[PDB]
Design a protein around this nucleic acid. Structure first.
Ligand SMILES: [Mg+2]
Ligand SMILES: [Mg+2]
Ligand SMILES: [Mg+2]
Ligand SMILES: [Mg+2]
Ligand SMILES: [Mg+2]
Ligand SMILES: [Mg+2]
Ligand SMILES: [Mg+2]
Ligand SMILES: [Mg+2]
Ligand SMILES: [Mg+2]
Ligand SMILES: [Mg+2]
Lengths: 109, 112, 51, 216
RNA sequence: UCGCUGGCAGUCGGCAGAGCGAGAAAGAGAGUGGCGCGGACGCUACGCCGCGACGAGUAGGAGGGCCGCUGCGGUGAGCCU
RNA sequence: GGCCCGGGGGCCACGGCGUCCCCCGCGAGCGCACGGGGUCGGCGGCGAUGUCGGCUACCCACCCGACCCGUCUUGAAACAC
RNA sequence: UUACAGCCCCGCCCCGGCAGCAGCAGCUCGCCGAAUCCCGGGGCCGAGGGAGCGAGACCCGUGCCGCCGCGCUCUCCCCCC
């Protein structure tokens, strides 16, 4: 009846100063701001949910406008709770600073 | 001196190097030491038969240290995890080049 | 064909295929640590009883 | 032929026995145990009698064939893997369903089934969850227990019982098993104040609530 | 790509007997006395297979092109209102 | 240190009879496996006029990168041709 | 100049005695591991495909095979669910 995922922001790609690696995304999960605090989310899978023009099939429902790219948190990134993620398709650059769902169910509690 | 870092390895260092990254120069090829017959067929003439007495020769150099070491292919080591201190300076001045006396053991642990 | 090199440090039976004595050595080590742990815990019990 | 005996080595750590080679020699007592040293079937016919072979050569050969595989050793079928359970999951605990159509609902855990799927029940009277299989990973185990130890679940409910068949109508044995388990388990949760309300509620995340911060 | 100038003619089959990887030269040696008819693939040897290490490049050198264009001798019982 | 020379609870790749001398060459069976490179003898949904798949190729959007080629020259994006 | 607080050094007390010990009072200060082992978690990956085993001129099986490490029976008792 309510939300079941954590909110994250797609901050950018894994990059040096002048080189971009599009196969690894950077997520900023809201609330966590520490390396020792970001351990809980390792291995959790994440979704990028967007809407397009024409209908697509929907598992367990009728076709609608929504589509998803599925990925997974790989490991932490820096001292400020930034995490790295790998999506099965590299994220489009129009998703910078947009909401990414981090699910709970790949759980190890 | 400026191009190397060197020291006195431990017995544990010898074991870790020989087991983890031990390759033999057989028929001038790089063959992985996965059993004892590879050592025996190339070094049995020196009554060193197994991995244990290969390690014994290397640690306590003994007589046929030259032959054992020449049998050993040079070890290919990863980058030092955690990072060096300063590549371009002597260890006495807080660098990494030169002669560590026995800190080479920490370097070996961190670089394997 | 080429053989996959397995790490003897992390793999037990490979360490035994290269050096059979490692087995007995590890058994002695494990038993020694267990005995020492129990001896220390009973000494701690004696110390707390003395307290 | 002698009766088999339990292994005389108590395992110290997996792969290592506690007693040495000659110590187990002595324990086995092998000092005093020293020892030293179809294709065709005949079938009558009403003539003579024909010798019929039960194996007949193929009447067709494919144009080309794949070769046999090199054979590995550590690869076992799924039916005989070792099944693991998280230490935080014990019978009588309250779980939170996270994925299926029952996502976000609090349920009661009963047993580890044969194939590693937890047997959740849920009280139908509380939150409309029946005796149902769930996956161990797709649940959050809360730290709230019920002393389910004195509960007798039927033994005929297993993986073959719960497996899908092929609209779907409910069955009478399913209903009666549900009724039996519910009648046995409900009075146990009525004894804990507010617990029926807790199980009737639904778990959700609101603003300012971070899962890593909160203790389950 | 280079090296090993490595391996494979052993597909040795009812006229049968399945091998040549294993620390330490050289005989799966010969002889003299004391029922059911069965057994995958392979080897254009200019082929196939197995290990190792290696891979920057202007001027320049060499090799391979079942890359490409036009014409001649052969050949495809080649193609086409 | 000498198999911890020798006399008066725990561990071990210790394990017959036969004798001369020294000091003091072939047992059977099964089974499990940290053992010469992955398998399941495990599953679930969605499918006929609107859905599924189609890297590549048509257009567009965004992030990072990205100076116009040929040439002589130590030196080219050159306000060098 | 110890009194209504203490502090610092001398000699005698078994190095005065008792824990403990590079200390869970989780950080007062080191180097380690043949004087070292166990357990857990996350991530990427699955390259190769006839390795045989067993009977044998009495046999024509079978597809779990090599090296390594083990377990039970072909001895006899006892104990527990
Ligand atoms: Mg790091
Ligand atoms: Mg310089
Ligand atoms: Mg080149
Ligand atoms: Mg830019
Ligand atoms: Mg010019
Ligand atoms: Mg000029
Ligand atoms: Mg130019
Ligand atoms: Mg200019
Ligand atoms: Mg001009
Ligand atoms: Mg000019």
């Amino acid at each position: 009846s309510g939300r079941l995922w954590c909110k994250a922001i797609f901050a950018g790609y894994k990059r040096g100063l002048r080189n971009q690696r599009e196969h690894t995304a950077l997520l900023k999960i809201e609330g966590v701001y520490a390396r020792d605090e970001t351990e809980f989310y390792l291995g959790k899978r994440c979704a990028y949910v967007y809407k397009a023009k024409n209908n697509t099939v929907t598992p367990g429902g009728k076709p609608n406008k929504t589509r998803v790219i599925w990925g997974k948190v790989t490991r932490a990134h820096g001292n400020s709770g930034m995490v790295r993620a790998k999506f099965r398709s590299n994220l489009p650059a129009k998703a910078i600073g947009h909401r990414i769902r981090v699910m709970l169910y790949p759980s190890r509690i | 001196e400026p191009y190397i870092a060197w020291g006195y390895p431990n017995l544990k260092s010898v074991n870790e190097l020989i087991y983890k990254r031990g390759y033999g120069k057989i028929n001038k090829k790089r063959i992985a030491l996965t059993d004892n017959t590879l050592i025996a067929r190339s070094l049995g003439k020196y009554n060193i038969i197994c991995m244990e007495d290969l390690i014994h020769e290397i640690y306590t150099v003994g007589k046929h240290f030259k032959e054992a070491n020449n049998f050993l292919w040079p070890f290919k080591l990863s980058s030092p995890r955690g990072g060096m201190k300063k590549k371009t300076t002597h260890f006495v001045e807080g660098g990494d080049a030169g002669n560590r006396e026995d800190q080479i053991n920490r370097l070996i642990r961190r670089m394997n | 064909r080429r053989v996959l090199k397995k790490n003897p440090l992390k793999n037990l039976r490979i360490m035994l295929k290269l050096n059979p004595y490692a087995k007995t050595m590890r058994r002695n080590t494990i038993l020694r640590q267990a005995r020492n742990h129990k001896l220390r815990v009973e000494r701690a019990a004696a110390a707390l009883a003395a307290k | 032929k002698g009766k088999p005996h339990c292994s005389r080595n108590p395992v110290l750590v997996r792969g290592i026995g506690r007693y040495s080679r000659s110590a187990m020699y002595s324990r086995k007592a092998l000092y005093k145990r020293k020892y030293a040293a179809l294709a065709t079937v005949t079938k009558p016919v009403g003539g003579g009698t024909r010798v019929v072979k039960l194996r007949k050569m193929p009447r067709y050969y494919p144009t080309e064939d794949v070769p046999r595989k090199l054979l590995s050793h550590g690869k076992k079928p799924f039916s005989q893997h070792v099944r693991k359970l998280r230490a935080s999951i014990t019978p009588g605990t309250i779980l939170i369903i996270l994925t299926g159509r029952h996502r976000g609902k609090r349920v009661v855990f009963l047993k580890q089934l044969s194939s590693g799927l937890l047997l959740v029940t849920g009280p139908l009277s509380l939150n409309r969850v029946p005796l149902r299989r769930t996956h161990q990973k797709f649940v959050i185990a809360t730290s709230t227990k019920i002393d389910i130890s004195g509960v007798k679940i039927p033994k005929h409910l297993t993986d073959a019982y719960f497996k899908k068949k092929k609209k779907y109508e409910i069955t009478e044995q399913r209903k009666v098993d549900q009724k039996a388990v519910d009648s046995q388990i409900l009075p146990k949760i009525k004894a804990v104040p507010q617990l029926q309300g807790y199980l009737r509620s639904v778990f959700a995340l609101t603003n300012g609530v971070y899962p890593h911060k909160l203790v389950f």
